[PDB]
Amino acid sequence: MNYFEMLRIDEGLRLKIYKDTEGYYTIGIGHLLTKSPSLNAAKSELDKAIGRNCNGVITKDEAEKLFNQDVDAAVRGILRNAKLKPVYDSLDAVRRCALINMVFQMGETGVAGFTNSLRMLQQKRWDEAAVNLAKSRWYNQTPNRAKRVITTFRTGTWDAYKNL
């Protein structure tokens, strides 16, 4: 299992504009379009993102393309970020996927503020980290997805996604 499949599970696939858990206009596999309330602003962003008049609808291939771009961005964001890079470098390949997942979901910026957890992760205090991660708005808002990522950091296996 890799970070692409993991995110495909957590985000779903939706071919028509929809609102995400925060009420923002999204399309595809968790591709945020605009935090603006206008359906018009969204469709506009959408069209600029795809390079065609989509009228609020995209194909599977278009969704997968957006997805690869967003994944690449999360990865490149971790590697460029002074707080995130050292953690990521310290992790094994499975836990690396978990960090990527957080970054895709909440942005570089958001993840970089979980200072305490990042430090635990680097020190490989898995249990302590799992506990600190859970005390967040993130966990309270999207508890099932957050448990899945937290278990991945805790055990270093794909158990939480093998169910699914």
CA distance 98 to 96: 5
Q: Which residues contact 1 (CB under 8 A, 6 or more apart)?
A: 97, 158, 161, 162
Q: Is 79 part of any known ligand binding site?
A: no
Neighbour-count burial of 122, counting CB atoms closer than 10 A to its CB (0-12 exposed, 13-18 middle, 19+ buried)? middle
- What approach was used to elucidate this structure? X-ray
**CATH hierarchy code of domain 1-164:** 1.10.530.40
CA distance 74 to 59: 23
Catalytically annotated residue among 10, 11, 70, 108: 11
Task: For residue 60, give the nearest of 15, 20, 17, 25 by alpha carbon.
Answer: 15
45 given a catalytic annotation: no
Residue with tokens 């978990």: 98
55's torsion region: left (phi>0), alpha (psi -120 to 50) or beta?
left
Strand, coil or helix: 125: coil
| Domain chopping of the chain, boundaries | 1-164
Paired strand residues for 32: 26
Q: Is 116 part of any known ligand binding site?
A: no
Task: For residue 63, give the nearest of 30, 24, 21, 18 by alpha carbon.
Answer: 30
